[PDB]
């Protein structure tokens, strides 16, 4: 009935801005932490032929000859870089991976930074939920926008990796409160019919945001400038999040009808197990793909933009596909297709870059088709549990990438096989 009792155009807009800058802040470490060509610092090179004698074949990116082989050997003439590394600055002027030597034995620290962020989202989305009964949606949006801004601008002045990772947890903690408050305010200040559409617009804004990261990165190579450009813009959103009025529904349930009466006046003046397995799988493979842009194709800038774009195309195709097929076949088929695409990429040769990029973009699009279909199917307690499982999956997606050291193919094989397995679960244990 509250839909009946019930500024929407303006509100969604005051929200397109945070939604356009959120993907940049989550998927920033694909460009700020990119891995540049690295080699051992050798006395013969930093104090073309000199490269060979100083550094063995693989130029190996982790070890160097103790004594130069003017003979050009045994693995015994190799020593780990005791003196450090010399990173290439041709493509990436500055990356965190170069600042805190996140290479070789530490190559897993980059995927962990991306999972500390994701955990910071889970722990945050949980806490902000508890504090939701006590504090309002608008104050929480405004604070969480400032928290993200302060912490995000602050990371540029972080002296050690621990502090960087810690200040990315705080930024993610804040972003969780932004996701919650934004969605909750928009849903609750619109009638139930327009609830869907509004969500489609928010989803499109996120897709444009992913695309825009590729562009922002193409312009701002320095990691410090990229972090400021993806964090500072939040201070403004915090100041422009004041006009948005507090959720009337919250006020009434809270107990304050007089305050609720004022805002409305102003606006006017203006199965479970199968589901969990699918939601975990989609997001443990999605996040794996979106956090591993460099392993997919060599051009990361094009790839991020294309990923953001293939989401819009997918949304639009989804409808026609659903016009003929069903919410179950589409989901399973799309998931299977995404897994197959991830498997194809690992197999496709490095030389054929266009093919590798095409398969990755097909994978991202297909994950988008499955995540759209799942949402419709999901709604048609449980939602909260699923989201908690989905967030856990997104925190174990960037973590499987830590295993690349041991088995390079482990990451793509796991994303592929898990996706294909969920495809079967959707097909057998989900109705229409």
Ligand X SMILES: C[C@]12CC[C@H](OS(=O)(=O)O)CC1=CC[C@@H]1[C@@H]2CC[C@]2(C)C(=O)CC[C@@H]12
Q: Which residues bind ligand X (CB under 6 A)?
A: 22-23, 26-27, 199, 203, 206, 210, 290, 371, 375
Distance CA 369, CA 391 (A): 19
- Per the CB < 8 A criterion, the answer to whether 328 and 427 are in contact is yes
Rounded to a whole number of angstroms, the minimum distance from the CB of residue 27 to ligand X is: 5
Nearer to ligand X, 94 or 119 (CB): 119
- Choice between 216 and 290, CB closer to ligand X: 290
Nearer to ligand X by C-beta: 104 or 302?
302
The CB-nearest residue to ligand X is 203
Residue closer to ligand X (CB basis): 95 or 210 = 210
* 124 vs 203 by CB, closer to ligand X: 203
What is the nearest approach in angstroms of ligand X to the Cβ of residue 2?
20
Give the nearest distance from C-beta 372 to ligand X in angstroms: 7
Smallest gap from Cβ 156 to ligand X, in A, equals: 22
Q: Residue 201 Cβ, how far from ligand X at the closest point, in Å?
A: 9
Q: How far apart are CB 29 and ligand X at their closest, in Å? A: 12
Nearest distance in Å: CB 308, ligand X: 8
Closest CB to ligand X among residues 206, 280: 206
Q: Nearer Cβ to ligand X, position 210 or 227?
A: 210
**Distance of closest approach, residue 100 Cβ to ligand X, in angstroms:** 24
Q: Which is nearer to ligand X, 177 or 203 (CB)?
A: 203
């Amino acid at each position: 009935a509250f839909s009946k009792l019930l500024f929407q155009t303006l509100q969604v807009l005051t929200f397109i801005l945070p939604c356009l800058m959120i993907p940049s802040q989550m998927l920033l470490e694909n460009f700020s932490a990119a891995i540049p060509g690295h080699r051992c610092w050798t006395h013969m090179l930093d104090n073309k032929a000199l490269l060979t004698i100083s550094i063995p074949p693989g130029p190996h990116q982790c070890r160097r000859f103790r004594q130069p082989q003017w003979q050009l050997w045994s693995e015994a003439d190799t020593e780990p870089c005791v003196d450090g590394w010399v990173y290439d600055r041709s493509v990436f002027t500055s990356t965190i991976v170069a600042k805190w030597d996140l290479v070789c034995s530490s190559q897993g620290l980059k995927p962990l930074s991306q999972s500390i962020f994701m955990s910071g989202i889970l722990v945050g989305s949980f806490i902000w939920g508890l504090l939701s009964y006590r504090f309002g949606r608008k104050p929480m949006l405004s604070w969480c926008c400032l928290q993200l801004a302060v912490a995000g601008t602050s990371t540029i002045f972080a002296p050690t990796f621990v502090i960087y990772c810690g200040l990315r947890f705080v930024a993610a903690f804040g972003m969780a409160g932004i996701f919650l408050s934004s969605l909750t305010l928009m849903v609750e200040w619109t009638t139930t019919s327009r609830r869907a559409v509004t969500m489609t617009v928010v989803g499109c804004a996120f897709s444009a945001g992913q695309a825009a990261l590729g562009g922002l990165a193409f312009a701002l190579r320095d990691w410090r400038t990229l972090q400021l450009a993806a964090s500072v813009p939040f201070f403004a959103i915090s100041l422009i999040s004041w006009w948005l009025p507090e959720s009337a529904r919250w006020l009434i349930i809270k107990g304050k009808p007089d305050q609720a009466l004022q805002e409305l006046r102003k606006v006017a003046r203006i199965r479970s197990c199968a589901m969990l397995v699918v939601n975990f799988s989609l997001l443990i493979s999605y996040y794996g793909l979106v956090f591993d842009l460099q392993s997919l194709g060599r051009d990361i800038f094009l790839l991020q933009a294309l990923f953001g774009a293939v989401d819009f195309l997918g949304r639009a195709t989804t409808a026609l596909l659903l016009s003929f097929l069903g919410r179950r076949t589409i989901q399973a088929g799309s998931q299977a297709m995404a897994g197959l695409a991830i498997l194809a990429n690992m197999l496709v040769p490095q030389d054929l870059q266009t093919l590798r990029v095409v398969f990755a973009v097909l994978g991202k699009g297909c994950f988008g088709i499955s995540l759209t279909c799942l949402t419709i199917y999901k709604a048609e307690t449980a939602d909260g549990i699923l989201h908690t499982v989905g967030r856990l999956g997104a925190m174990m997606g960037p973590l499987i990438l830590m295993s690349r050291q041991a088995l390079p193919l482990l990451p793509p094989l796991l994303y592929g096989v898990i996706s294909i397995a969920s495809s079967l679960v959707v097909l057998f244990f989900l109705p229409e």
